[PDB]
């Protein structure tokens with residue numbers, strides 16, 4: 001079965017697309033290296049993601065599936081009311097083709113609610129007719145060496161709300177129960193590091209590897225998608241939920257027709273849709289299932305998995321370098337049979353720091369006392385490129401804010417992102433202005449002035465005093481700054497001292513940002529005690545589940 005079939009109709013934009021970087025130069029001067037993907041490259045992506053999938057299952061697969069269902073059976077899940085579902089809808093979510101928008105949904109306008117009721121009722125009465133989806137090219141920023149745009153497939157606003165009602169509770173609670181500690185989205189960055197470091201430490205003689213499935217969404221078969229449903233259905237559910245879940249699966253999740261922005265039929269999908277509520281959960285369960293089975297086929301000893309959607313990292317007991325090399329090829333052959341072939345082949349690693357998963361890795365620094373501290377970091381190229389874009393253009397999603405929150409302990413986030421953006425917020429007098437950012441796919445509204453206590457709550461006080469970073473980490477940053485033409489430490493330190501001073505003179509939370517975020521920039525350090533406001537912060541539903549493509553909004 002083909003993941004996609006196409007009519008020949010083009011994937012079209014719904015607005016003018018910028019692929020070019022037009023204050024921003026002060027951040028990064030090699031602006032010709034920064035580009036954004038557009039629909040013009042859609043054809044290239046279409047070719048990559050269109051192929052025949054072959055799948056052969058074995059006893060290991062079946063044993064693991066049985067084990068997952070058994071745990072899934074302990075879960076009780078609730079229907080969301082229409083109101084609860086509406087409030088989860090982002091204010092700028094794509095409007096319905098049926099005469100109402102996200103604002104109408106959020107306001108609970110009777111037109112929107114009446115339509116949502118009719119969609120739900122239709123779901124219960126009809127469990128066959130494929131549901132329409134829109135296919136678009138994503139507009140994302142990168143640095144050269146060029147990626148063709150990613151494709152986004154999503155149903156109408158009315159359907160998405162119904163998805164929330166039927167499955168939000170399921171995709172928010174089920175994965176963690178089924179996969180336990182292996183479920184990646186339950187962790188803040190600090191917690192993700194702790195689990196990785198400790199898992200590594202716990203092996204007698206550890207070996208680990210990241211596994212990249214080539215175009216994971218396309219590798220997901222209709223069988224895979226029904227297997228996921230069978231897992232959902234193990235939950236203790238209301239008869240209405242079971243019916244809706246079954247209808248959504250047959251009518252939307254397993255596949256359906258693709259319609260472009262102009263309304264033309266572009267083709268038909270028979271794999272994972274990137275823009276539905278179950279994408280993250282489905283991908284995570286499916287990746288976990290196949291990888292767990294593959295471990296057994298490959299006879300990897302004491303396999304420990306960490307899974308985030310299609311992102312997979314494995315840490316096990318080494319059986320020797322040659323033996324490991326051979327075991328990994330077997331693991332890969334098993335994954336391939338399950339319809340999850342690798343992009344670039346996995347390779348054994350024997351240094352935790354060298355394992356990149358979720359585009360990030362663990363590294364070491366030292367706190368004020370000289371004590372060792374592990375933190376999550378990544379190559380800063382993309383974050384910096386997108387930071388430049390967001391400086392030179394108005395964008396609804398502030399990746400820089402999300403990056404500061406997730407990578408606050410890193411040298412590059414502290415040195416560059418905090419300095420550059422707080423300087424801009426000072427000039428524009430928009431310190432008090434709340435901004436939208438994404439965490440694990442979900443959209444959050446956050447006040448930049450709260451960053452100190454947010455960071456203390458997530459990464460601890462040491463985040464404000466990390467030094468003596470690894471040479472490997474610094475070389476990567478330096479190499480990146482060279483590549484992108486970014487000013488060196490001496491320049492950012494000078495800028496940071498200026499911003500820090502200006503922040504202090506405003507007092508209040510502003511001064512707190514100056515004192516904590518920029519203590520690194522001053523030669524005589526302040527004392528930095530626990531921020532009292534860091535305790536009374538509501539940081540519960542931040543790191544519970546993934547929702548990439550799931551159209552979720554919180555707070």
Ligand SMILES: CN1CCN(c2cc3c(cc2F)c(=O)c(-c2noc(Cc4ccccc4)n2)cn3Cc2ccc(C(F)(F)F)cc2F)CC1
Nearest residue numbers: 411414415466467468469470471474475477478481489520
């Ligand atoms: C061959 N290798 C070359 C470099 N290598 C290293 C250089 C380092 C550090 C560790 C290294 F191994 C380190 O640990 C700190 C530091 N610690 O504490 C703060 C304070 C601080 C905190 C937060 C933000 C900024 C400064 N800065 C500073 N530098 C100097 C440095 C060089 C290059 C870059 C950059 F990458 F930008 F080119 C940035 C740097 F800082 C050793 C030998």
